[PDB]
Enzyme design. Structure first.
Site, PDB file in Angstrom:
ATOM      1  N   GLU B 206       0.780  -1.243   0.000  1.00  0.00           N
ATOM      2  CA  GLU B 206       0.000   0.000   0.000  1.00  0.00           C
ATOM      3  C   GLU B 206       0.819   1.305   0.000  1.00  0.00           C
ATOM      4  O   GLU B 206       0.264   2.394   0.136  1.00  0.00           O
ATOM      5  CB  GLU B 206      -1.074  -0.035   1.092  1.00  0.00           C
ATOM      6  CG  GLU B 206      -1.991  -1.267   1.011  1.00  0.00           C
ATOM      7  CD  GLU B 206      -2.535  -1.586  -0.392  1.00  0.00           C
ATOM      8  OE1 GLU B 206      -2.815  -2.778  -0.656  1.00  0.00           O
ATOM      9  OE2 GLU B 206      -2.726  -0.647  -1.201  1.00  0.00           O
ATOM     10  N   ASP B 244     -10.453   5.248   9.101  1.00  0.00           N
ATOM     11  CA  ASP B 244     -11.036   4.193   8.268  1.00  0.00           C
ATOM     12  C   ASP B 244     -11.022   2.893   9.088  1.00  0.00           C
ATOM     13  O   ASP B 244     -10.145   2.715   9.931  1.00  0.00           O
ATOM     14  CB  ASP B 244     -10.238   4.083   6.966  1.00  0.00           C
ATOM     15  CG  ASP B 244     -10.925   3.298   5.841  1.00  0.00           C
ATOM     16  OD1 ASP B 244     -11.769   2.429   6.146  1.00  0.00           O
ATOM     17  OD2 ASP B 244     -10.566   3.518   4.660  1.00  0.00           O
ATOM     18  N   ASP B 320     -17.139   2.052   2.006  1.00  0.00           N
ATOM     19  CA  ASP B 320     -16.135   1.458   1.131  1.00  0.00           C
ATOM     20  C   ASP B 320     -16.483  -0.008   0.841  1.00  0.00           C
ATOM     21  O   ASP B 320     -17.333  -0.275  -0.010  1.00  0.00           O
ATOM     22  CB  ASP B 320     -14.731   1.678   1.709  1.00  0.00           C
ATOM     23  CG  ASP B 320     -13.665   0.943   0.896  1.00  0.00           C
ATOM     24  OD1 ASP B 320     -13.923   0.633  -0.288  1.00  0.00           O
ATOM     25  OD2 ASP B 320     -12.589   0.593   1.440  1.00  0.00           O
ATOM     26  N   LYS B 345     -14.098   1.526  -6.314  1.00  0.00           N
ATOM     27  CA  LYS B 345     -12.954   0.718  -6.756  1.00  0.00           C
ATOM     28  C   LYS B 345     -13.235   0.177  -8.163  1.00  0.00           C
ATOM     29  O   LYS B 345     -14.188  -0.576  -8.337  1.00  0.00           O
ATOM     30  CB  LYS B 345     -12.763  -0.391  -5.716  1.00  0.00           C
ATOM     31  CG  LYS B 345     -12.111   0.098  -4.413  1.00  0.00           C
ATOM     32  CD  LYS B 345     -12.351  -0.877  -3.253  1.00  0.00           C
ATOM     33  CE  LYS B 345     -11.401  -0.612  -2.082  1.00  0.00           C
ATOM     34  NZ  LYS B 345     -11.959  -1.125  -0.814  1.00  0.00           N
ATOM     35  N   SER B 372     -10.446   5.059  -6.157  1.00  0.00           N
ATOM     36  CA  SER B 372      -9.464   4.538  -5.193  1.00  0.00           C
ATOM     37  C   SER B 372      -8.719   3.259  -5.646  1.00  0.00           C
ATOM     38  O   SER B 372      -9.101   2.614  -6.629  1.00  0.00           O
ATOM     39  CB  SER B 372     -10.210   4.288  -3.880  1.00  0.00           C
ATOM     40  OG  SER B 372     -11.103   3.203  -4.013  1.00  0.00           O
ATOM     41  N   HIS B 373      -7.640   2.915  -4.918  1.00  0.00           N
ATOM     42  CA  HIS B 373      -6.698   1.805  -5.182  1.00  0.00           C
ATOM     43  C   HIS B 373      -7.202   0.398  -4.790  1.00  0.00           C
ATOM     44  O   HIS B 373      -8.065   0.271  -3.923  1.00  0.00           O
ATOM     45  CB  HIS B 373      -5.374   2.124  -4.458  1.00  0.00           C
ATOM     46  CG  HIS B 373      -5.421   2.059  -2.939  1.00  0.00           C
ATOM     47  ND1 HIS B 373      -5.207   0.939  -2.148  1.00  0.00           N
ATOM     48  CD2 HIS B 373      -5.632   3.114  -2.088  1.00  0.00           C
ATOM     49  CE1 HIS B 373      -5.287   1.315  -0.855  1.00  0.00           C
ATOM     50  NE2 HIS B 373      -5.555   2.631  -0.792  1.00  0.00           N
ATOM     51  N   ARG B 374      -6.600  -0.663  -5.362  1.00  0.00           N
ATOM     52  CA  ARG B 374      -6.633  -2.062  -4.833  1.00  0.00           C
ATOM     53  C   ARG B 374      -5.338  -2.404  -4.071  1.00  0.00           C
ATOM     54  O   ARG B 374      -5.056  -1.692  -3.113  1.00  0.00           O
ATOM     55  CB  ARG B 374      -7.014  -3.094  -5.915  1.00  0.00           C
ATOM     56  CG  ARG B 374      -8.361  -2.874  -6.616  1.00  0.00           C
ATOM     57  CD  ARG B 374      -9.556  -2.512  -5.723  1.00  0.00           C
ATOM     58  NE  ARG B 374      -9.875  -3.516  -4.684  1.00  0.00           N
ATOM     59  CZ  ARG B 374     -10.855  -4.397  -4.699  1.00  0.00           C
ATOM     60  NH1 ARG B 374     -11.507  -4.693  -5.773  1.00  0.00           N
ATOM     61  NH2 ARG B 374     -11.224  -4.991  -3.608  1.00  0.00           N
ATOM     62  N   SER B 375      -4.556  -3.414  -4.491  1.00  0.00           N
ATOM     63  CA  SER B 375      -3.246  -3.776  -3.890  1.00  0.00           C
ATOM     64  C   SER B 375      -2.059  -3.980  -4.865  1.00  0.00           C
ATOM     65  O   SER B 375      -0.931  -4.053  -4.414  1.00  0.00           O
ATOM     66  CB  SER B 375      -3.391  -5.002  -2.973  1.00  0.00           C
ATOM     67  OG  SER B 375      -4.189  -4.692  -1.855  1.00  0.00           O
ATOM     68  N   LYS B 396      -9.145   9.225  -3.463  1.00  0.00           N
ATOM     69  CA  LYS B 396      -8.319   8.486  -2.473  1.00  0.00           C
ATOM     70  C   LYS B 396      -7.026   7.970  -3.108  1.00  0.00           C
ATOM     71  O   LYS B 396      -6.765   6.773  -3.162  1.00  0.00           O
ATOM     72  CB  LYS B 396      -9.130   7.422  -1.705  1.00  0.00           C
ATOM     73  CG  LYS B 396      -8.410   6.929  -0.428  1.00  0.00           C
ATOM     74  CD  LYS B 396      -9.358   6.155   0.484  1.00  0.00           C
ATOM     75  CE  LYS B 396      -8.703   5.670   1.769  1.00  0.00           C
ATOM     76  NZ  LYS B 396      -9.705   5.097   2.681  1.00  0.00           N
TER      77      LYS B 396
END
Lengths: 436, 436
Positions: B206, B244, B320, B345, B372-375, B396
């Site tokens: 991350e 969060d 989320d 996402k 926003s992001h994943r991994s 994000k």
């Protein structure tokens, strides 16, 4: 090479009962042919197909189809070139894809489904495999275990029948020709009793009756006394009963309540999901029944969060419009484990490839997908023959009287005129949700 | 008429962490170009659409994906045969309605997103304009603010941090050319103090560090004390705070209990639909929590009727993995009003067309939509093109210390250097859940 589908179009006429339609045709460079078409009708605010009419008042109340057909026509053709007739699944997808609206509202799913069923008859004079055998391969000997509503109620009716329907499943008979005999003719013994009673004998639009009893609880005694008088016993000895104790129709959304003053008189019952449940469980003791349809409501998902530890292993609960056929409500349905059965209706999904897909996704999990009607049938067999495409379980293809229902029930033993001894099916032991 | 997708080609690839994923190239009659590759990583129990894995030992381990492009090759292309490259409505809905399965398992949600990204670039490889200015129209000009993974928790560390990340916004910077840095000068001031205290400065998947902070204190508090020492002022004239929560994982399904012991150690607690906010109510008055994210469980519906009414007029509640982006769960969370922003996402919603429809429908419901992001993420800029396309106020975007995060600004700043003057700006006035 002669295998190509070269040209595709559709034409402008009326369905059975005489309202306008959107009707589709397939041909090949080999010269082989098939028409393909649809059931008629849908709702709004729920995940079905979209029904599309150019509102020009000059003809048939303004319910004409021309919006769709003069959009559809040369819009289908420009997608469908460079393909075989056996390229069914690529074709089926390509026209949903061409519509390209998420709700299937440019072509209408009923135009897309038209070409889909049209291709599913057009290799037959070329490969020598029909329809269901063409789709599925060599497995497809199996005529399905059937059911019908001969005794209507609900949204369609003048009757007190607050159930949307009183139903039979002629399951307890080892050959399809023995389900289609032991009590379908007995509707004429009912006709003799109605004449002796002085009642009307005009048909309902499935082909059955909306009989004008002094209340719906006389039809409860009628069938299991009629089979007792036929010389046979109300168990696996011939037939078993279904109901549609129509949850979505007696449910009031504002009060969160199943209230039968929707259909019945001044004193009729008011029941939440808990009074409705603390009533409903008894019907396996009472006088026996195997099935109910739309057992809890389309909005009453909490009613389905009641039903498993209560009725779940005692009755087949067909989610009919509880699922409106749809793979999305079914895919939620199995993860939430809402019902134990689903009704599958071809214009509530939109192609042959989607209809067999829903049935197979249900069969690998264990949900009893009954492939099935809408009140509006057409001059087609194919809504029934999808039941042969995998051997799966069960079918609901309308009452034994109407010409547009006989266009299926004739096929459901004309297959046996070629197959003869090759045909086989499952009996009472076909409910792959029950008796485990 | 050199206008056509003549041919499109999925191609086998590796991804970050050292496993495989899916990629695509669109070719053309013009020699014009559209590659597409995807963000990687997904979640379970609550719906996300399919990524495909195999029994292979030849192209990595069995988490391996030569597989998808060991067979999908001849499928996706023909549904778009003879089409203009533009029509991403009639073309992503075409590849969606080529899979047709409810969980999108025929092609895979990596495949339909891959060809969607390919067709997106290819659509401005016709329309000539800077493509993000196709995605939003020319008016790609109402600038978003960052929020990010500033302090670690969840899966990635030893550290006693049940919070999925702590968060802030930079708020005192009058233009984004400072406002990005005025959330990031923070990070090098923090990192110097990590070296001085002897904390680690290696980064996780991350892109933040793997530090060992104790729950809510010094890790975030060094990013209180910095916005005083740096000459910035104590709030909006500066940086403002947020949480969060790993709620749906620390929510024990047997005890009906939030229990921090999965992610915290022996200092953990026990709470329900109730007492979670009998705790959190006391906190936003104490730390300037302008945001909370994913605070309450997926099935703890009162948890959202608590956090969205016991506090949420003083706080942005970002849902989320409560939502997992899905339009059906989002529509339930809209109707019951269970959050006041959505974290979006891209691969939770299967295509750029469905990502755009989800983001549009989210602002029509009044939520700040936050992409926003994943991994693990691959060097195609198109998910960065979603930033300039969306005209809202927040993203994000992720912490400014790993290559998948850095790679966004090689697009955003080189777009900005083409135009200069175009901007309308926010910073703190960045929500549609406040000042009503």
């Amino acid at each position: 090479h002669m295998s190509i589908i070269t040209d595709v179009y559709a034409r402008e006429v009326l369905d059975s009962r005489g309202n306008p339609t959107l009707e589709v045709e397939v041909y090949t460079e080999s010269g082989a042919f098939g028409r393909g078409m649809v059931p008629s009708g849908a709702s709004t605010g729920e995940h079905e197909a979209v029904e599309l009419r150019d509102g020009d008042k000059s003809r048939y109340l303004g319910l004409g189809t021309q919006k769709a057909v003069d959009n559809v026509n040369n819009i289908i053709a420009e997608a469908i070139i460079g393909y075989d007739v056996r390229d069914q699944q690529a074709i089926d997808r390509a026209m949903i894809a061409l519509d390209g609206t998420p709700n299937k509202g440019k072509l209408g799913a009923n135009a897309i489904l038209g070409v889909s069923i049209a291709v599913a008859r057009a290799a037959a004079d070329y490969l020598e495999v029909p329809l269901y055998t063409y789709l599925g391969g060599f497995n497809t000997k199996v005529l399905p275990t059937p059911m019908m509503n001969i005794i209507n109620g609900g949204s369609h009716s003048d009757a007190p029948i607050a159930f949307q329907e009183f139903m039979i499943m002629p399951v307890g008979a080892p050959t399809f020709k023995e389900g289609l005999r032991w009590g379908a003719e007995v509707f004429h013994a009912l006709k003799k009793i109605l004449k002796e009673r002085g009642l009307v004998t005009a048909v309902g639009d499935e082909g059955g009756f909306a009989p004008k009893f002094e209340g719906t609880e006389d039809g409860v005694e009628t069938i299991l006394k009629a089979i007792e008088a036929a010389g046979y016993e109300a168990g696996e000895n011939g037939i078993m009963i279904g109901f549609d104790c129509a949850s979505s129709e007696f449910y009031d959304k504002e009060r969160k309540v199943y209230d039968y003053t929707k259909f019945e008189g001044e004193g009729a019952a008011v029941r939440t999901s808990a009074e409705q449940v603390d009533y409903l469980e008894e019907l396996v003791n009472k006088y026996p029944i195997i099935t109910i349809e739309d057992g809890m409501d389309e909005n009453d998902w909490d009613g389905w969060k009641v039903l498993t530890e209560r009725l779940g292993k005692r009755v087949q609960l067909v989610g009919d419009d509880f699922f409106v056929t749809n793979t999305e409500y079914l895919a939620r349905g199995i993860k939430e484990n809402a019902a134990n059965s689903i009704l599958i209706k071809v214009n509530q999904i939109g192609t042959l490839t989607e209809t067999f897909e829903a049935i197979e996704m249900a069969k690998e999990a264990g949900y009893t997908a009954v492939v099935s009607h809408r009140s509006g049938e057409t001059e087609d067999s194919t809504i029934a023959d999808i039941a042969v495409a995998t051997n799966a379980g069960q079918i609901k293809t309308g009452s034994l009287s109407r010409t547009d229902r006989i266009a299926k029930y004739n096929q459901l033993l004309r297959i046996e005129d070629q197959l003869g001894e090759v045909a086989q099916y499952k009996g009472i032991k076909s409910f792959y949700n029950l008796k485990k």
